[PDB]
Design a protein around this ligand. Structure first.
Ligand code: SPH
Ligand code: SPH
Ligand code: MYR
Ligand code: MYR
Lengths: 59, 300, 235, 235, 300, 170
């Protein structure tokens, strides 16, 4: 959860030099980005998620 | 028969168990470096024809000529195999489609897409049961001045969402099964409001993989990317996947092929470019069973 | 030292009882013009959302199952009168067997069907079921049809629902208050908690991102925009 | 012969269940204009004073924990009507999980969260919790802040409470009467008793000499003179 | 797996145990001369640089010249050590304070007091994480005709009480962290009554150690006494103490140094005497981690 | 004392052309702007910091007698030091030919008449980057491309700690 006490820091991306293209070629392009966990990774204390719900449910 | 074993401890002693019942079902639940970059379970991560130990790709009289191969993947790390304990099964090239600056994506289903392919199709309809794996070869070339990226996804049991908001699970057999022709993705959900005379077909939204899940996560499925910059073709080797050893090829589709523009097609400067995408697919280690008179479907 | 991945093992992940349904029954005054209420539930993991979303991380699964039953009751009318302790009968009616039409009838004799006689106020009832699938694994998704439309035969006969296999996979739970009609009425509720034991799962999938809309993968207009606004260059 | 120091060992010293809180819930008549009352308690050892003073003999601690629940109920109005036996649901909502907004809602499905279904009149409920700290030890005192005020950013953003780490350390206990609204109303109370097992403690401190005043070390004017009058040369 | 063992008996036979559960947490609690003057647990009693086996005291270019040493103490019997499995860290002398017939006491916090000390301070603000132990050397001389006694206390997690009676735990970061300057004790509690515009700072009452506990008991903490009669200086060797192996030096202060007049300063006959108290502190076995752009705090 | 890894970064397209000469000069003393007085460049001007400092095609004598500019005037073909650029290659160097490569890496040792020295008073190495062959592109009359320098100190060590040096850099 977002919590200052256990904050993790900042990822940011920059132009080191610049994107350079020749004539007759597109001046704008896209980058895709991906994330995953490394094998040193683990989690604890199983819990219910907020990423789905039945609000209409009644239990 | 008392069973003694090590307790689940911290990191600075054990417990005892006896089974009281005859059926295992009654039993309690029995609870069970150097380089981080390495995958715990590789096979779940889309390996290569190379990466498990396995150019001219050839089946029967049909043959692909490929340098591209680091661009291949063996689904779930598992190679096609015979139901253990034929040149109807060869490479069939389907109708070529066109990728444009506004395409949202394309889908197909197996075996369905191959239902009319020579002796394969025949064999499929003359038998009750059939099983098969596949080699899917997606072909799409452009120039060094073109750009774009195709996400090629192989989905097991690829159930897609329907056009209706008044009734559910109602897409007709005819509509669900497009054959070779294809079937396509859309950018927005458009509810079939014609109550009285229902369209009874799918409405697959691209960013939701046509199934209620986010496209960005579609990569947990056996896949491959065609980045126009680096490669012009992708090869997916698909195993027979199912809750059964063999099934009805006519009633049930095992795999779904989804192709979506991860990055939009672009060229030099033309306001509206185009390039072709050709699919060549081959059934593998395939076998049929329960021969009788031919199935004549109401495909329409 | 060294972190363990144990609590995220497939068993540990599902090692919890989840509410899969709430059944309502009652026991009315004999006089009453309306019938005594008994419950008939069709067994499924899809009536509630949480266990469903978790299972659907996977295409196919295999597991022994544990059902636990929490029964609560209460008074309906101002009345001020009372009722003696209730005993409940939880009968499992497998696909094929006679479904009860009345709190009263012969089906409740339960000679071959499994029944649980629960006494109100006692520790919640509990049983285990083996992996009862007719296939080698339970199928969380079926991209296909129950039956194929034959050109020959008529259009209506050849028709069936998309994504559905048997009209009746696992049969049903029938519940009743065994006690006879009581002057003052009591309404009861049965909560069915499900836990998968000894579990195995195959072929992973992305989690459901938009609200469920029925037993299938279908989605509803107006529920399709889960993600929140957040600008590109903003931490 | 020879005296043992055993009953004053750190375990023996804490080897007792202590009341850490009293939760109130109820189950009203359905008619009622006011909502059915369910309890939401934020887990802590600081709402009561005795266990707190004992733990605070130490700066840091490490222990498995045992919670025991004593449930009592009673009638609110003259009424003369009655209620059938109540079943309580004690749900643990860990930091991050959906907190219940209604006795009724979906959060109570409890698919992944731990819940205790308690039957009124039965032996007090009880569970054990491991050492769940995210640090190597529970910290009884934190001379610091949750966040550092950056010159750059605005004054308000950089601010936080003194001595506090996470806005939510251990999450919360949510409690409800599972039974449906009853004509005649019953109010219940849940007493939570806490006992530290398998305990270790570090860095000793002097006992609290003046009345506690909130979650921190703060003291209140007018409570600062604990000691009694007694003259120097008087036995 | 049944475990048999000796029962807790008087002094003129045993019991049996079996663990039913897989998690140790579920387990029941497992219950475990000549010279009286000797301490059961010495380390809890404030040992000497001498008393655990360990004059010119020197770190990098910095060096104390000390005869005084029986006057030293190693907190919790534990010597500073590297986070196991640098000349920024040397002796820094802080601004000298003045002890008078009416001083109530002084306090400081570590690392805070050292936040502006040369390369140490720099290192602290350029890194996310840092850990360090300390050598605290309190200097205070007088004549053979002066008298008085200073109680030097090293408190772990020294949380101090605030000025408000309407709200709690509200002392501002700025006020909580005085830096080298210091921070001081008071004889009486004075509630910040300015509701609208709060002082938001500590109000540390001397006889209550500024934290709600009696000063007379402050000796259970690592400490040392400067008795003007017998010695003019005290040396405290402090280990890194925390619930973590390493932490944020900017957000969290590990140790608190409290200096209080146990016995009031007095001289010959002067109605109002004075003598200086100088603190020289050195970080020890210290290490930092998680380098990035510099932290610029709003200290004001 | 310290050594260095100098990494010069400069990319272009297959249709661009040009060549950069990257020179690492030991004791790179540069010539001054004055013709009335010698060895007179101010500490401030001699030491530009990260900012840089640049070469010129022609010598322009600081004629302001009374209030002197007191700075360098480095002529390109004379390596700013009275020697011919064509011979600058006897110095540790590397070439970035846009045709073949987009970056250069120079690993520099500590070089000096001493084992260790004052980093504040004395500069050990000089990095000079000059266009051996002029930048050109497709057909644009006036092209541009970026050159980024990433530098790392190596096997480095310091000595003689005390209060901080606060230079009058201006
Ligand atoms: C006295 C009570 C007896 C209760 C007996 C219950 C037996 C029926 C168990 C069915 C378990 C179904 C679990 C989910 C199955 C489904 O995944 C699928 N649609 C798979 O093919
Ligand atoms: C079904 C009931 C489950 C109950 C689960 C309770 C889990 C949460 C346990 C937290 C224990 C906290 C003990 C005291 C911790 C605190 O000392 C501190 N502020 C320390 O960092
Ligand atoms: C192996 O199990 C032999 C040792 C068994 C210990 C005897 C006590 C067990 C009591 C329960 C058995 C009855 C349960 C069906
Ligand atoms: C070691 O424990 C072997 C001897 C065990 C004696 C058998 C009787 C124990 C009965 C309880 C076991 C079941 C509890 C999970």
């Amino acid at each position: 959860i977002d919590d200052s006490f256990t904050e993790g820091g900042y990822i940011s991306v920059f132009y080191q030099t610049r994107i350079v293209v020749p004539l007759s070629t597109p001046r704008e392009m896209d980058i895709l980005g991906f994330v995953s966990a490394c094998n040193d990774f683990s989690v604890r204390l199983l819990r219910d998620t907020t990423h789905i719900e039945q609000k209409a449910l009644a239990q | 028969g008392a069973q003694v074993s090590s307790q689940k401890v911290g990191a600075h002693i054990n417990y005892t168990t006896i089974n009281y019942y005859r059926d295992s079902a009654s039993n309690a639940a029995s609870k069970q470096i150097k380089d981080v970059l390495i995958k715990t379970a590789p096979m779940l991560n889309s390996p290569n024809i190379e990466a498990c130990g396995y150019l001219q790709l050839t089946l029967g009289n049909s043959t692909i000529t490929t340098q591209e191969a680091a661009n291949s993947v063996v689904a779930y790390g598992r190679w096609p195999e015979y139901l253990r304990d034929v040149a109807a099964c060869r490479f069939y090239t389907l109708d070529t489609v066109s990728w444009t600056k506004e395409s949202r994506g394309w889908w197909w289903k197996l075996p369905d897409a191959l239902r009319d392919m020579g002796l394969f199709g025949q064999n499929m309809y003359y038998h009750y049961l059939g099983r098969s794996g596949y080699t899917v070869h997606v072909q799409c070339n452009a120039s060094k001045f073109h750009q774009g990226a195709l996400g090629v996804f192989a989905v097991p049991e690829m159930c897609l969402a329907g056009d209706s908001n008044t009734t559910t699970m109602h897409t007709s057999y005819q509509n669900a099964n497009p054959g070779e022709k294809g079937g396509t993705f859309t950018g927005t959900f458009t509810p079939d409001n014609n109550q009285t005379s229902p369209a009874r077909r799918f409405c697959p939204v691209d960013y939701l993989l046509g199934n209620g899940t986010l496209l960005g996560n579609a990569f947990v499925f056996p896949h491959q990317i065609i980045n126009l910059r680096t490669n012009n073709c992708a090869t997916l080797v698909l195993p027979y996947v199912n809750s059964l050893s063999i099934d009805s090829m006519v009633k049930h589709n095992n795999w779904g092929i989804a192709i979506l523009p991860l990055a939009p097609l672009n060229f030099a400067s033309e306001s509206s470019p185009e390039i072709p995408i050709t699919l060549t697919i081959a059934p593998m280690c395939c076998e049929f069973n329960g021969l009788r008179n031919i199935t004549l479907p109401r495909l329409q | 030292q060294h972190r363990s991945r144990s609590e995220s093992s497939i068993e540990s992940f599902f090692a919890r009882g989840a509410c899969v349904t709430i059944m309502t029954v009652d026991n009315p005054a004999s006089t009453t013009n309306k019938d005594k209420l008994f419950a008939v539930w069709k067994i499924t993991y899809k009536d509630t959302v949480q266990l469903r979303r978790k299972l659907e991380f996977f295409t196919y699964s295999r597991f022994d199952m544990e059902l636990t039953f929490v029964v609560t009751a209460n008074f309906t009318e101002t009345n001020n009168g009372h009722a003696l302790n209730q005993v409940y009968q939880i009968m499992y009616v497998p696909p094929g067997a006679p479904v009860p039409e009345k709190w009263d009838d012969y089906t409740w004799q339960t000679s071959s069907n499994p029944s649980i006689f629960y006494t109100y106020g006692t520790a919640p009832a509990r049983i285990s079921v083996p992996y009862v699938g007719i296939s080698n694994a339970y199928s969380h998704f079926y991209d296909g049809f129950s039956k194929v439309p034959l050109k020959d035969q008529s259009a209506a006969l050849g028709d069936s629902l998309y994504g559905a296999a048997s009209l009746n996979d696992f049969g049903i739970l029938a519940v009743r208050v065994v006690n006879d009609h009581n002057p003052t009425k009591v309404t009861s509720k049965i909560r069915v908690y499900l836990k998968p034991k000894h579990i195995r799962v195959w072929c992973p999938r992305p989690p459901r991102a938009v609200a469920y809309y029925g037993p299938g993968v279908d989605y509803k207009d107006g529920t399709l925009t889960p993600l929140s606004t957040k600008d590109l260059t903003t931490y």
